[PDB]
Amino acid sequence: TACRKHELYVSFQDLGWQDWIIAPKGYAANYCDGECSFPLNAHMNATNHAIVQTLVHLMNPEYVPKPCCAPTKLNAISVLYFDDNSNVILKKYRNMVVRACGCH
Amino acid sequence: TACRKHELYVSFQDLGWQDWIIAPKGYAANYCDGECSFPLNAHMNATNHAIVQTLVHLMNPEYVPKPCCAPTKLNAISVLYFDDNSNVILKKYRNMVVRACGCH
Ligand SMILES: *[C@@H]1O[C@H](CO)[C@@H](O[C@@H]2O[C@H](CO)[C@@H](O)[C@H](O)[C@H]2NC(C)=O)[C@H](O)[C@H]1NC(C)=O
Ligand SMILES: *[C@@H]1O[C@H](CO)[C@@H](O)[C@H](O)[C@H]1NC(C)=O
What we know:
Oligomer: homodimer
Radius of gyration of chain A: 19 Å
Largest sheet of chain A: 3 strands, antiparallel
Largest interface: A-B, 31 and 31 residues
Number of helices of chain A: 1
Structural class of chain A: mainly beta
Keywords (chains A, B): Chondrogenesis, Cleavage on pair of basic residues, Cytokine, Developmental protein, Differentiation, Disease variant, Disulfide bond, Glycoprotein, Growth factor, Osteogenesis, Secreted, Signal
Protein name (chains A, B): Bone morphogenetic protein 6
Strand content of chain A: 35-45%
Family (chains A, B): Belongs to the TGF-beta family.
Distance between the termini of chain A: 17 Å
GO molecular function, one term (chains A, B): growth factor activity
Helix content of chain A: 10-25%
Number of strands of chain A: 7
Main location (chains A, B): secreted
Bound molecules: a molecule of 2 linked components (NAG-NAG), 2-acetamido-2-deoxy-beta-D-glucopyranose
């Protein structure tokens, strides 16, 4: 139940890109989920702010929430698509895949 | 209800660090709160992944969650403190003050 990367597959049909695209038909976009709480490492899975916010939340849970599980590393995906002039284009889409999660 | 920066003043005395922390006696540590949903405001600086995730969540709310409202721009603060051996240390702690929030 800790802050971690979960598997998620996105087909290009879900984006309505299916008719445009040749390869791939989808990709593993993945997602960050989990409770953000101690232990926390400021050189691994948390920021200094996230450590301080966890402390404030423990003292006053009413008004300040816990930090949240978000990406630390994102990868690009390369897509091969057709255009109207029947050109074959290779486009790199940055910040598209989740590699590692952390508390922010 | 939308993702934004909320003001929060962190005083070291309520944290219980007043003895060993010389300067400052507190600081404006702010926090991120709110829903990451469409419309995604340009200030959010949402990644391509966050956009896809808010879209995937809208189709299957059951399994895939909304992306995180987290800090996009942090500031460092200098802390003057007493070491465990009574030495006076002047450390710059990075990622300490939230300047701006966003979705990822
Ligand atoms: C942040 O990273 C640390 C270690 O780098 C993770 O530490 C583990 O915490 C879990 C939960 O208590 C335990 O199973 C292990 O005993 C811990 N290892 C160490 C070396 O302390 C920690 O879970 C991570 N935090 C989050 C929110 O993901
Ligand atoms: C800035 O704003 C938009 C829309 O929310 C986003 O898609 C883009 O990636 C952001 N740019 C940077 C440089 O963070």
